[PDB]
Each structure stands twice: as C-alpha cells, then as structure tokens.
Write a protein that binds this ligand. Structure first.
Ligand SMILES: [Fe+2]
Ligand SMILES: [Fe+2]
Lengths: 124, 125
C-alpha cells in the first residue's frame, strides 16, 4: 500500500514545459494546482511543474506506453523536430533501441530534462 | 490513455545508503542493483533509480500515497530514527502532521536533502 503519487519538475517556463510533455505524450491538458501545473499519467502519479527560481538541473522521466502510443509519440517528436537518441548517453542520434524485447527512444524537454518512452518494461 | 510513469533517477552521494534509507522507512522490498543504479520499487509500477556520485545534490521532491495503517508504521519509523519532520513543505511547522484533503500527511528529508512526503488522501482521486 505504497505508491509514488507525485514529484515536482522544475522548469524555466512552468506552463510551457507542462504543455510540452502532455502534448507529446498525448495526455490531457495540464491543470493548475497551487503553484504547479500538473501533468497526470495513468498509474496514479502526476508530474507537478513548478516555475524556476534558479538553474534547472536535468532529471530523467521514463514512460511505459502502448505500442500504438509509441508510434504516435514518435511521430510527434519528428513533427516538432526534436533530436532523439536510442540510448541515455545520446551517442546514437536518430535511432530507437529495441531493448528488453520492446522499443524505446530518448529525447529532451525545453530545459533539457531527459525524456524516454518504452513499450516493454525491464523485468516485467 | 496507455501512458505510465515507469522510472526516474534519484541523485545521491551514497547511492546504496540513500536507496536503503527510502525502502526501509517506506517499508518496501530491499533495493536491487541495475547497471550503475540501486532500484527501489513502489506498488504502482514505478521504480526509483538511485545513482551515486552526484556532488551537492539538487533537492527534488517525492511524495507517496500510503494506506492508513502504513502511514502509522512509516511515521513510527521516522520518529524511531529521530528524524526531523514537518507538516508543511516550507518546514515551518516541525513535529506535527498536516490533515490535507481530510487525510494525514508528513514531510521529512532524505540523506542528501530530498523532500520526502507521505499522504493518505489525494486531491481529486
Ligand atoms: Fe530511463
Ligand atoms: Fe507534495
């Protein structure tokens, strides 16, 4: 009976970064809550975007998506012209990985947060 | 929607001590090594990958929804370790809990200063 419920994502432009993630992932538009702009995903966790007082240090947020959703999100990445890579080290641009019997790709948010989607989880 | 948060990296100086600290206090299974990370798993299919070698860590915030009984057990372990704790994210109200959303909640800090929090009733859901 222990779940991760939310975490804060620091941003330069709080509203733009929240809209960016929700748009690319195909989620509902974010909602204001306290000082945050909240992006909700399906396993009962939300990402609370907060505006930046200081240097934004990039974090890593990876999402398990359906096979069809993978194609749609990948299409939006190319549609916006976002650089992307097969690997967390960004040594293989313009490729996807096929780790763990699934498919996965990495890209960056407006502040350089490392974003990643995958279709089959490690282990599970 | 078919979109879930699957994992995120938790930066630490001492990867293993930070991982053991979170799993022990939260009452989770012992962490597992995965590449350079020590992974802590929670029940809604998200894993927290702790990585070592981050100098001064930039504090992040991780809040956990727990059952009513688990709240008492996790709060009991916080008190038993003698950890400072607060009702509010601003750490202005020490040694008390909040009752946000009709529930119960408390804040504390991990070995590197990450803002940790448990709550029993979420807004909306
Ligand atoms: Fe990842
Ligand atoms: Fe919180």
């Amino acid at each position: 009976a222990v779940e991760l419920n939310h975490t804060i994502v620091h941003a330069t432009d709080r509203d733009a970064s929240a809209r960016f993630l929700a748009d690319i992932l195909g989620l509902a538009a974010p909602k204001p809550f306290g000082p945050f702009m909240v992006v909700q995903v399906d396993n009962d966790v939300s990402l609370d975007f907060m505006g930046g007082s200081g240097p934004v240090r990039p974090q890593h947020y990876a999402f398990l998506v359906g096979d069809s959703e993978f194609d749609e999100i990948f299409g939006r990445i190319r549609e916006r012209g976002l650089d992307h890579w097969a690997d967390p080290g960004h040594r293989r641009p313009g490729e996807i990985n096929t780790n763990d019997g699934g498919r996965g790709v990495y890209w960056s948010d407006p502040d350089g947060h490392s974003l990643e989607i995958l279709t089959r989880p490690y282990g599970g």
